[PDB]
Structure 1
Amino acid sequence: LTNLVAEPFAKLEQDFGGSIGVYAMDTGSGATVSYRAEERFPLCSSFKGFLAAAVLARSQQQAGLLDTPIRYGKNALVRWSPISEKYLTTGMTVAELSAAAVQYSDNAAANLLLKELGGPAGLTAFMRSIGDTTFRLDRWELELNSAIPGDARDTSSPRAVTESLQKLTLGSALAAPQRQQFVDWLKGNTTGNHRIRAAVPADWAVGDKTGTCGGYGTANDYAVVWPTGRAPIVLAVYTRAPNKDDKHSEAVIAAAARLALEGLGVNG
């Protein structure tokens, strides 16, 4: 049930000037669309969704984790911390930091939550615990964005991203309340309007998490989409390009998402 209908992903990535990786699953039938789906691509900020899921998983065993206030100093504020910079003088709760990391890609929040989990290895351990053997986080913000060609640090594959996203949003990897909280944070994302969401009709529910590295044409988005009247779709679109100065393209991500939905026969 993989690639029952071929789609012109090769022409799309050639026009883009790099590589595009796509994995999309129809959770009703199990049909999939797959293009470069087992290649590694940099996660960039997309690890922050899984970070929030790992915090939610811990909160199942640590009541009151989500409500814990976290104070931090000016030295925690790295570039692109649009929410945590407004609460520097007051602190924020773990839940607020998680929402900021997911919904605004807030970097200070992400690093503070990584510390709570035991660093990049602790997030990697969580992914191992749900059966993901591909994901690896190795560094912190902002160093993890280097996006060096051939470097496996801070990468996963579109397939593993989609499989893990399915487990966490629709499967049993989180308990039901935490699962719905994770879905709600993804639905509230503000950074993805020009990526997968641009391919999704306005009357369908969707949650997503973006990533943008800042070099090597490297950017991404993953999402769970609920078309009305049928089972949800889970998908991941990752890009990279050979030259450091190559620019990423949101339009290419949206276009690849459209092709994935067409390949699955989902009228959009």
Structure 2
Amino acid sequence: DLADRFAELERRYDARLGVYVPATGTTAAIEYRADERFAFCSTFKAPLVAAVLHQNPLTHLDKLITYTSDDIRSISPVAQQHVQTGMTIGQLCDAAIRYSDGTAANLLLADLGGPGGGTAAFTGYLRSLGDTVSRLDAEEPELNRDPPGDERDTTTPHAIALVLQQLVLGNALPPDKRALLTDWMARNTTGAKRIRAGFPADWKVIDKTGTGDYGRANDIAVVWSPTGVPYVVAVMSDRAGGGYDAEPREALLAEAATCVAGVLA
């Protein structure tokens, strides 16, 4: 019966909705278009920070990276201010998650090394977690522009939710590194009107947003009930019917999160 409300929200916004909440000991898994491919957009910037933390010790965050003004080719509120001074790997992680900095994301990919600017290394990291579906193929800002139906730079609510589960609630990272990733996601500034807006204020919310063309708007989050019970929420949406210039609807993600909160209560 919850599937009829999701299909009702799809009618209201002219969108395609993907939702997945992994099942716990007391609740059944919520699925709606869970195993259908959706575009990553900025969603990968959360497991990417975990990938750099995974292959390098904590002192590697102090290595200073220098770049030129020609390297800034996407939304970069922080990288635009340090083209003369440079930015350390640690500040690049903080900028990539808390501000969705596109230039810091591309530099992190080059820090991962390998073919394709690091896209092969990143997909290789996801496979080590058990995700044999998702794949990253391009860098910013091209990874938001793939046409509908293309399998490049895609994930599924089923796949990305289980990856986020291991990184925040699981053992994919040691505790000291797990604390830095969770704290950055906790001080995010770009998700105030999506999943966070659909849950009551006494629920703690950490999230990482994504936005692209074709009206694509994603938000992946970990929420804590007022008692302290954790859940993983993956909400993804696109509006392919409207073309390349379709505007994303933030209210859709906030509404669907209220539907999930009513079930988990």
* 1:25-40 equivalent positions in 2, closer than 5 A: 25=22, 27-29=24-26, 31-40=28-37
- Identical-residue share of aligned pairs (%): 46
Kept after mapping to 2: 8 A contact 1:28/1:231:
no
The separation in 2 between residues aligned to 1:75 and 1:6, in whole angstroms, is 47
Q: Which amino acid aligns with 2:110?
A: K
Whose relative contact order is higher, 1 or 2, with alpha carbons under 8 Å and at least 6 apart?
1
Partner of 1:103: 98
- Note if 1:148 corresponds to 2:147: yes
Kept after mapping to 2: 8 A contact 1:212/1:219:
yes
* 1:217-232 equivalent positions in 2, closer than 5 A: 217-232=215-230
The separation in 1 between residues aligned to 2:234 and 2:54, in whole angstroms, is 22
Partner deviation per Cα, 1:16-54 (whole Å, 9 max, x = no partner) = 112010011354535321100110001111111111111
- Note if 1:233 corresponds to 2:228: no
TM-score (norm 2): 0.93
Flag structure 2 segments of 5+ consecutive residues without an equivalent: none
The separation in 2 between residues aligned to 1:7 and 1:180, in whole angstroms, is 38
Kept after mapping to 2: 8 A contact 1:132/1:160:
yes
Between the two proteins, the alignment pairs up a number of residues equal to 259
Partner of 1:185: 184
Partner of 1:124: 123
Partner deviation per Cα, 1:66-102 (whole Å, 9 max, x = no partner) = 1111111111112211011111111111111011111
Secondary structure, counterpart of 1:149 in structure 2? coil
Kept after mapping to 1: 8 A contact 2:222/2:231:
yes
Partner of 2:133: 134
Partner deviation per Cα, 1:172-197 (whole Å, 9 max, x = no partner) = 11111111111111111110000000
The separation in 1 between residues aligned to 2:204 and 2:176, in whole angstroms, is 18
More helix by share: 2
* 1:67-78 equivalent positions in 2, closer than 5 A: 67-78=62-73
Q: Quick one: structure 1 residues 63 and 49, their matched pair in 2 at CA, closer, same or farther if it must change by over 3 Å?
A: closer
Structure 1 runs of 4+ with >6 Å offset: none
* 1:145-184 equivalent positions in 2, closer than 5 A: 145-184=144-183
Aligned counterpart for 1:20 among listed residues 11, 14, 17: 17
Aligned counterpart for 2:74 among listed residues 66, 74, 79: 79
- The CA deviation at 1:244 is 2.2
- The CA deviation at 1:63 is 4.4
- The CA deviation at 1:230 is 3.8
Q: Which amino acid aligns with 1:56?
A: L
TM-score (norm 1): 0.92
- The CA deviation at 1:203 is 2.5
Flag structure 1 segments of 5+ consecutive residues without an equivalent: none
Q: Which amino acid aligns with 1:258?
A: T
Kept after mapping to 1: 8 A contact 2:20/2:34:
yes
Partner of 2:258: 258
